[PDB]
């Protein structure tokens, strides 16, 4: 309830004119007050529409000011062009900045003038520095200047923040004012004709610098920001890659004193174990060279902080490192060219000096792993291998990007890259031919996509046809669904938390063992991911083919095999001007159904093969190896105690034993820590990388101005929890500026906190961070009922595509691969399901969402609507709340910190109740009926459809099950058992279980099975209504936790809930 005051001050500051007028609009769920709001509205518009002073009425209608709820504020203000400079000249009295063109290796990666690199606009491209966000730099500057203006009279630590950010913003505004501000077009692009006389990389530098200086709260933050902002203006290729590299060594220097553990059964369990840090001597010399590069690039204060920290190697000063490790990735992306980014990967050194003893074992281990994965389904003759074709055609992801193509649906032309639409096209013209796999050769090389991420290389993406997916689908699904019952993969270690993705950095650590951890992200072009990998899988397929007798399965397996045959020789379309290059690349990357598990397999075989060579010089027992695609760590335990020389020699042996296979590596051995791209542990404490650029994006999505405010707030929340903290007021300023909409050149509307923070399809943020909010009042109920009525909208483009011939044909062809006695129950169902993935096509989503926003605006302008009773969640919570009773409590501190970078209130909760004892309610459609259909088919009929289908007679249900391949005897047994009344109740239990509101970012981490939280929740037991008592206890926990987060103190609760309200609520439970 504070946002709106900052909104008012922002409006007053930005416009400032006599002509700038401000027009509230209100609402109330109470008839009389609502009609008085209507009145107020009318009279205000009239008075505005009559050149009368508006300031007189504002006293008379005090009632609206006290009890009504705000929606929005309108604004009539004229063009007033160029006001940014007219404000900004004062905050720019320092000296501007000069680039240094002789820093980056390439020529165009320097921050030189555009015209020196792009004389013609026809060859200009903003894609090498595109912020890719529908908000301007001028917007960012306006926000910064307003913040600076309002914080112009404070005298505290706040003033030290203001002086620091003022000096930084002076450096920035000095750099911009040297030339001026670029002006956005309607699309938020920056054309050639504005950037012609300015540096090419000024905008990204500006945005990133704003993001950094808005995240300054201390002196060391100021040092970091001044030392990165002045070098990120020139260096754009060797900065985040440089400073983020030493961290991998630093983790091997932090003594553990107190630890968190994880079980095989995936539960945290703290340990007071102490572990030293047996670091060798030569890695310090490496680290010094890295700091020498750091100083040689032009960094002075931040080497000083890393060198004076090593005098003590304490863990209390250590979050600084983590802080630094996050300050590197908030400088922007290194959006270089498709060509040179591919050539970062497409440099190869293949040699006739490697072993053969290694590759043969490698091939065999891959073979064996494949057989372990595939023994059960290949043998027991599973439907999904038999019906692999249909399985892949249902699971066609509708963003999949195979080969842009000119289509026509009746009377249109479409340039879709989506493979579902391509399949719809190819079914009609007789070209659908999944058994005949296309080649990938000179006659048909592959396109590319570009994956950028700061501090690392630009990675590449294959863009394949749609036959390869269909071939790979069934086998890879059985592989995943097997190996998540098994070690060595992220599918087994993943839900949200600690006790997961790693969960065994910290069992097998002491002064007996070590751990070798290794980044393997460059190992895609390597000589060990070519021929042996493919031939190993091919051999395994031969074994598995001889391990079955049915013929569709042999066909599917032979097609997967032939896919690996064709992918063994693979060329790559890349244009360059007029001519087209195609390069020999017979190796592995993503853009495939297979890449994750197969890379994990190959790395597993590789590390298992390497690890049988250290045994020639050491005695150890391998306790654990873990592989998640392109990373790997192995722990190993010894017959004796560890030394510095053994770690060093082991590292050299690892490096040279990879060198024997012509494989580059930075071998890293340690005792307490690891480092990988996204996270790391030091001293038995998990930190994380907070490298999510807010004001600069990777690529250009398809969302609106609106939703980008929500993504930016989500990234803010994440980065804040991770450690990187930005000023929340700035984020709110951006949200209002991005939800602002131009109805004309001079009319502009601004919504309020009570529209953006309400649970709907229009939610953007929350009134109190780290807490979703619900509604006990009339008013949230009112607007939620209103907005739920409006979420359901239409798309004429979708309507005409779904009314064409190819869509009908597609449903029919899907159908005819199965039985032919259901025509109005599933064909409509499959069409309704395909509709859920036609919306991926951007113009459909844009039509629907622009229509949705227009429907919103035609009740933001004029008064509001009651929406006719359509029930939602807050209706229920409104009835649950008035039988609670609070009392002040006092919990002690008995739980350990193991995520230091969190805010102190969240940590205080962790420091008073426990971290996660994880639970499960359903691992997907478990109840009675989908685990039969998923055994005889793959089809996934929606629970709406089942809730209807069970309500029908038992005859056409019997027909429907027989139509899905099932025999008659099991249907007869199902009807005789009388389970349909049970699966009504199980399905409605599953409907209440669909409430996903346990995992938003702060509820993600808290343990609700705690005894300390539970003794506060004194709700007596009634019985025979499990859903209600479940949700009541859950909701009471959420009340306690949210009060704790927002206020720190604790409370107890009590709900002597009447039986009458249990029953009155029971019918609204299992609806909506």
């Amino acid at each position: 309830g504070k946002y709106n005051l900052i909104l008012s001050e922002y409006l007053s500051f930005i416009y400032n004119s006599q002509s700038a007028v401000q027009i509230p609009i209100y609402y109330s769920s109470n008839s009389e007050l609502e009609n008085r709001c209507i009145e107020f509205h009318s009279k205000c518009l009239e008075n505005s529409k009559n050149g009368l002073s508006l300031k007189k009425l504002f006293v008379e209608y005090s009632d609206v000011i006290e009890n009504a709820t705000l929606l929005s504020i309108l604004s009539y203000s004229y063009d007033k062009y160029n006001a940014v400079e007219r404000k900004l000249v004062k905050y720019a009295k320092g000296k501007p900045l000069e680039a240094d063109l002789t820093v980056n290796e390439l020529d165009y990666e320097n921050n030189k003038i555009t015209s020196e690199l792009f004389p013609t606009a026809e060859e200009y491209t903003d894609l090498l520095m595109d912020p890719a966000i529908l908000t301007s730099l001028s917007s960012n500057l306006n926000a910064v200047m307003f913040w600076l203006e309002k914080h112009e009279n404070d005298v505290a630590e706040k003033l030290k923040i203001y002086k620091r950010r003022l000096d930084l913003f002076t450096i920035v505004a000095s750099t911009v004012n040297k030339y001026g501000v670029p002006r956005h077009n309607a699309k938020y692009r920056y054309e050639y004709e504005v950037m012609k006389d300015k540096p090419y990389y000024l905008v990204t530098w500006a945005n990133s610098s704003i993001e950094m200086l808005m995240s300054v709260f201390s002196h060391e933050d100021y040092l970091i920001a001044r030392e990165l902002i002045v070098l990120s203006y020139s260096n754009r290729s060797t900065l985040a890659k440089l400073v983020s590299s030493p961290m991998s060594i630093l983790v091997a220097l932090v003594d553990i004193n107190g630890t968190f553990i994880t079980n095989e059964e995936l539960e945290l369990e703290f340990s007071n174990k102490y572990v030293r840090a047996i670091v060798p001597d030569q890695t310090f010399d490496e680290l010094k060279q890295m700091l020498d590069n750091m100083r040689k690039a032009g960094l002075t204060d931040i080497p000083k902080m890393i060198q004076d920290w090593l005098v003590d190697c304490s863990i209390e000063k250590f979050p600084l490192m983590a802080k630094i490790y996050s300050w590197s990735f908030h400088v922007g992306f290194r959006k270089q060219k498709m060509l040179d980014a591919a050539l970062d990967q497409l440099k190869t050194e293949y040699t006739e000096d490697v072993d053969d003893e290694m590759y043969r074992e490698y091939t065999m281990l891959i073979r064996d792993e494949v057989v372990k994965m595939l023994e059960e389904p290949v043998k027991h003759d599973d439907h999904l291998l038999q019906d692999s074709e249909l399985a892949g055609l249902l699971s066609m992801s509708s963003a999949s990007n195979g080969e842009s193509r000119q289509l026509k649906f009746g009377r249109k032309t479409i340039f879709s890259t989506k493979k579902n639409m391509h399949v719809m096209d190819d079914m009609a013209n007789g070209r659908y031919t999944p058994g005949i796999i296309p080649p990938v050769n000179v006659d048909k090389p592959i396109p590319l996509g570009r994956r950028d991420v700061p501090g690392r290389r630009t990675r590449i993406i294959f863009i394949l046809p749609y036959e390869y997916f269909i071939a790979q689908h069934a086998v890879v699904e059985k592989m995943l669904i097997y190996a998540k019952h098994t070690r060595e993969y992220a599918e087994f270690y993943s839900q949200s938390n600690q006790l997961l993705s790693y969960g065994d950095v910290t069992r097998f650590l002491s002064n007996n063992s070590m751990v070798l951890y290794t980044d393997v992200s460059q190992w895609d072009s390597s000589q060990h991911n070519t021929q042996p990998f493919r031939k190993g899988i091919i051999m395994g397929l031969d074994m598995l083919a001889n391990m079955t007798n049915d013929a569709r399965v042999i066909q599917t397996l032979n097609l997967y095999k032939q896919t690996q045959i064709n992918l063994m020789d693979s060329y790559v379309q890349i244009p360059d001007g007029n001519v087209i290059k195609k390069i020999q690349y017979g190796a592995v990357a993503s853009g495939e159904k297979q890449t994750k598990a197969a890379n994990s397999i190959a790395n597993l075989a590789l590390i298992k093969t390497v690890l049988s060579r250290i045994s020639n010089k050491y005695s150890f027992a391998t306790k654990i190896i873990r592989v998640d695609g392109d990373d790997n760590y192995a722990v190993l335990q010894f017959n004796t105690e560890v030394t510095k020389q053994m770690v060093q020699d082991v590292s050299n042996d690892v490096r040279e034993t990879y060198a024997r296979m012509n494989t580059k590596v930075k071998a890293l051995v340690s005792t307490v820590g690891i480092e990988i791209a996204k996270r790391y542990i030091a001293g038995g404490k998990i930190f994380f990388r907070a490298g999510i650029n807010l004001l600069n994006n990777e690529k250009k999505g398809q969302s609106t101005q609106w939703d980008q405010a929500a993504v930016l707030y989500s990234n803010y929340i994440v980065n804040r929890l991770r450690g990187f903290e930005t000023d929340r007021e700035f984020i709110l300023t951006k949200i209002m500026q991005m939800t602002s909409v131009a109805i004309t050149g001079s009319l502009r509307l601004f919504p309020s906190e009570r529209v953006l923070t309400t649970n709907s399809t229009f939610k953007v943020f929350d009134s109190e961070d780290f807490i979703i909010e619900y509604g006990t009042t009339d008013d949230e109920v009112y607007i939620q009922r209103a907005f739920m009525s409006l979420s359901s909208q239409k798309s004429g483009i979708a309507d005409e595509i779904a009314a064409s011939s190819t869509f009908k044909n597609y449903v029919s062809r899907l159908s005819e691969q199965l039985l032919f006695s259901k025509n109005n129950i599933v064909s409509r169902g499959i069409a309704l399901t395909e509709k859920a993935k036609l919306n991926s096509y951007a113009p459909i989503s844009l039509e629907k969402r622009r229509a949705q926003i227009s429907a919103l605006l035609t009740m933001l302008q004029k008064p509001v609507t009651f929406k006719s009773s359509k029930i939602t969640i807050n209706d229920i919570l409104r009835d649950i709340k008035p039988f609670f009773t609070v009392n002040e409590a006092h919990l002690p501190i008995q739980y350990q910190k193991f995520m230091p970078t969190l805010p102190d209130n969240v940590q205080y909760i962790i420091q008073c109740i426990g971290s996660r004892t994880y639970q499960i309610e359903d691992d997907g459609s478990k109840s009675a009926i989908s685990r039969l259909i998923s055994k005889y088919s793959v089809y996934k009929p929606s629970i709406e459809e089942l809730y209807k289908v069970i309500s029908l007679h038992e005859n056409e249900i019997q027909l429907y099950l027989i139509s899905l391949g099932i025999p008659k005897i099991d249907a007869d047994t199902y009807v005789g058992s009388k389970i349909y009344s049970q699966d009504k109740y199980r399905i409605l239990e599953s409907y209440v279980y669909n409430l996903l509101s346990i995992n938003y970012g702060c509820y993600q981490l808290f343990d609700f099975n705690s005894p300390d939280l539970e003794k506060l929740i004194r709700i007596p037991f009634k019985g025979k209504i499990p859903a209600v008592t479940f949700i009541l206890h859950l909701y009471a926990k959420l009340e306690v936790i949210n009060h704790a987060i927002k206020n720190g103190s604790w409370i107890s609760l009590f709900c002597n809930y009447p039986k009458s309200e249990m029953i009155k609520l029971w019918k609204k439970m299992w609806n909506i």
């Binding site: 001519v579 087209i580 020999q584």
Partner: peptide, 7 residues
């Protein structure tokens, strides 16, 4: 229409 080759 035009192409280039590498091996």
């Amino acid at each position: 229409v035009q192409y280039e080759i590498l091996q």
